[PDB]
Design a protein around this ligand. Structure first.
Ligand code: NAI
Ligand code: NAI
Ligand code: THR
Ligand code: THR
Ligand code: NA
Ligand code: NA
Lengths: 321, 320
């Protein structure tokens, strides 16, 4: 049978495109998408059935929703990310720790296959910055990263103790056109496309040769589905690195200027994103993911930049050609 | 002379640590607290500067710290390996939230803060022989999971805010005064009691499962020394320390050498065994030795002599 899929924190950058892909793939009646906020008037999930409000900090309301829908899969997405978590750490520790605790308990009690994403932010400067391994020293420099190490370890314990089918990937920076990003260090990339279409100066808070692992949303969606469709027997671990390709702001800029045939104005003025990003790996080793469940990546930076420069005007109404 | 707050003070470590701090620094300079009040036979009963505080009551915790103005804090409340696997919601509440509250008070009220970690923070990928200070951490217990969180959170407080967070990964700690709180290494203490009562000891750790351990007097020396060290000596926030490693069969032999009497011990593969088997056999504590002079006086036989002398005195068990 097709799965019944619950998405929590579903209205954000990842949730928006994942929810659309799941409804398309499995049918709208087999998918329940939820978030603590309502879709805004321009949000692609506005006016649709199967969209609920849920604050995942309310464990009793989380249970009620799970009881009623009876999911077989859950993608638990709420988290406060790197830059915002440094400014709002008490909020990051509440959401990132307690919502995860609650989601895992419900996966236990209701026999749900549960995906909680981790992040390159779980790594710090001791990880081995080149082709970082799946198992290595983790010394995250942000409270977000600290909370995502805890997530990985706590999920893994739920699998060992109770047999909860917990699965996770360490996502790189995710690029998409649909929903603006939620305040991480990689957010500059999305913002540089908007500046280029508006012909405005881009003030980039990440320095020009700071390379980071990144991935374009279509590849991300294929992997998020693939890892959840895999039989449990095929998975040799609970947490996998995945990457798309790495780039620096200067490489992103060169790619956009190739597509628009048009020089863009960028000022590099260091923001908190920089020192955060500088502590992250430059690239990841994702061989285990490729071997166990078939992770792959089809987009390169120029393909991405062609697609983003097309989609942003369509979805957000900015000047195109 | 510092002003020292100890939370979780009525337990195995806190009982002895609290007495040692009062003796070194003066009773007037040491305030200790616990969620429970001490019973009439507790070593801390009847002493001034022993308060009732639930560290999950953040306003109460803040009130106490503000009034006393500690310069040092030892934050000891935690649910340990065996008990945490049976009561994991309590472990996650206590081990994560009280730690978060303690670090926030250390930041706001300028306190040098010690929070112990543990060998439980390691699992089967750590390199179980002479485990390094920096390695892969894959703990198999919710207690260990929460202690990796504690180390990484405390380290983030130091990097971000300049808070003087200090930690060691403690081995199994042996002492006579206060019975232990539900960890896998508790068999060791229980075997000395069984030997003195001449009862059969049912040991839930298999006979050759060796673990890092330390006797309390060495523990107390190091817990003070690390806190006294100047920052310029410390290259790390979290240090391994160890005393010596032993298995249950080794302990049994040490006890039988003292009493010249055989103890009846039945070994079984209990919950403790599956936990203990995931932990290191020995630790590399070279960084702690080099940076701040961690040192160990007791070996297994000295320890056993002292324990068999002290348990009768402190608990009324039959002597010799
Ligand atoms: N965007 C990225 O590059 C990466 C994201 N991931 C992660 O994947 C996740 C989803 O990320 P994004 O979609 O980019 O974040 P986002 O910030 O765009 O979306 C997060 C959503 O969570 C919801 N939320 C916050 N608190 C909630 C609560 N108490 N209950 C229910 N919903 C709540 C928000 O309203 C929001 O719509 C996270 O766990 C994040 O760490 C990890 C790595 C990469
Ligand atoms: N005993 C050992 O072998 C080892 C202990 N450590 C640790 O050192 C610590 C102290 O350990 P033990 O003395 O052996 O534990 P214990 O279980 O003997 O003492 C814990 C004490 O904390 C108190 N407590 C629990 N909840 C509290 C709360 N909400 N507010 C205030 N007090 C609360 C208990 O009443 C208690 O007296 C822990 O953090 C533990 O992880 C780490 C490694 C070795
Ligand atoms: C990389 C991921 O964790 C997120 N976009 C961040 O920058 O925090
Ligand atoms: C070793 C320490 O963490 C504790 N005595 C336990 O056995 O859990
Ligand atoms: Na980097
Ligand atoms: Na061991």
């Amino acid at each position: 049978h097709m799965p019944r899929v619950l998405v929590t924190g579903a209205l954000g950058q990842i949730g928006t495109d994942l929810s659309l892909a799941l409804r398309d793939k499995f049918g709208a009646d087999s998918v329940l998408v939820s978030d603590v906020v309502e879709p805004g008037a321009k949000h692609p999930l506005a006016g649709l059935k199967g969209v609920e409000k849920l604050d995942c900090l309310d464990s009793n309301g989380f249970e009620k929703l799970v009881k009623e829908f009876k999911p077989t899969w859950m993608y638990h997405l709420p988290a406060i990310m790197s830059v915002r978590g440094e400014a709002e750490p008490d909020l990051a520790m509440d959401i990132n720790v307690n919502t995860t605790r609650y989601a895992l308990e419900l996966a236990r009690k209701y026999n749900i296959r549960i995906f909680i994403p981790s992040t390159i932010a779980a790594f710090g400067d001791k990880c081995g910055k080149t082709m970082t391994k799946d198992d290595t020293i983790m010394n995250p420099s942000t409270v977000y990263g600290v909370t995502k190490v805890y997530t990985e370890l706590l999920g893994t314990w739920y699998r060992q103790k109770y047999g909860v089918d917990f699965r996770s990937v360490r996502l790189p920076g995710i690029i998409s056109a649909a929903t603006l990003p939620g305040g991480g260090a990689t957010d500059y990339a999305i913002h540089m496309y908007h500046s280029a279409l508006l012909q405005k100066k881009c003030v980039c808070p990440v320095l020009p040769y700071e390379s980071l692992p990144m991935m374009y949303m279509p590849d991300t969606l294929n992997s998020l589905v693939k890892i959840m469709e895999a039989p449990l027997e095929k998975l040799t671990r609970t947490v996998y690195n995945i990457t798309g390709f790495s780039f620096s702001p200067s490489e992103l800029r060169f790619s956009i200027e190739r597509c628009t045939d048009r020089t863009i104005e960028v000022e590099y003025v260091e923001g908190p994103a920089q020192k955060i990003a500088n502590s992250w790996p430059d690239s990841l080793d994702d061989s285990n993911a490729r071997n166990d469940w078939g992770h792959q990546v089809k987009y390169d930076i120029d393909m991405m930049s062609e697609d983003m420069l097309r989609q942003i005007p369509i979805l957000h109404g900015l000047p195109s050609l």
